[PDB]
Amino acid sequence: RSIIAQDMFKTAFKGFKDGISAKCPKDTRLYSPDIQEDCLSSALKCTIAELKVLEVECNVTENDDFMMIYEGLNKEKWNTSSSSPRNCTCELYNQTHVKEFVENMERLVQLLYTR
Amino acid sequence: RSIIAQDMFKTAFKGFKDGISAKCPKDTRLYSPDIQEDCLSSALKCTIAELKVLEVECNVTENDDFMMIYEGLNKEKWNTSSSSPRNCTCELYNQTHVKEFVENMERLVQLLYTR
Known part of the structure; x- marks a missing residue:
């Protein structure tokens, strides 16, 4: 469990989920x-x-936090494997407000560091 | 598609969705x-x-809409078929608040009637 990367996510997630809502239209989903x-x-x-x-x-076209989050996801090698893998469709998920979106996102990264 | 049933779900999801939040702890997920x-x-x-x-x-008692939604979910026979049906665990879904829970519940019921 790579505590250095997990802490960089944790802080980047906290320093974004707490600022966001305010940084996006209330009707963003x-x-x-x-x-x-x-x-x-x-x-x-x-x-x-x-x-x-x-x-x-x-905004977030800049943002230290956003860039670290985005760049982490495309470059970190994840264990996303299973015995019966399946192709989900993004638009078949639930839509949510921007803050809940990053919370779930934090939950998806915690899980994949646990395995 | 049974228009009679979609119409009752429509009335029932509108009346139930409006009173909630204020009927639940904000802490409810x-x-x-x-x-x-x-x-x-x-x-x-x-x-x-x-x-x-x-x-x-x-504090949902005794909601006419709630026990309509509930008993409707258990008795109606939906087409829940696909090329490759799988099992999913409840606790691996997202949590959210009440407003979006029924909102997503509605969307699902609509999908089921669409097929």
Whole structure:
């Protein structure tokens, strides 16, 4: 369990989830993938893909926190594997407000560091 | 599609969704299933279990809409079929607040009638 990377996520997630809402239109919504055992890989690609939809919806085209989060996801090698993997579809997830989106996102990264 | 049933679910989801939040602790969080094609039957069993959870923690008595939604979920025979049906765990879904829980519950019920 890579405590150095996990702490960089933790702080980047706290220093973003607490500022956000205020940094996005109240009516912004995003598809929030969850942690179903067999859809980890999909759930990762959609999380990254809605980050982009959040990059034009709000400021965050800059932001130390946003860049660390985004860059971490595309470059860290994850164990997203299972015995019965499945292709989820991003638009089949629940849409949510921007703050809950990063919370779930924090939950998806904690899980994949646990395995 | 049975227009009679979709119409009652429409009235029942509007009256139930309006009183809630204020009828529940803000601290209440419920698992909220999505509409992924291969887990609809799981998604329905989890929506039903958590409605029960919403029961015991909320001041929802005796809601005509609630026990319509609930008993409707258990008796209606939905097409929960797909090329590759799978099992999904309730607790691997996202939690959210009550407002979005029924909102997502509605969306799921609509999907089921759409097919």
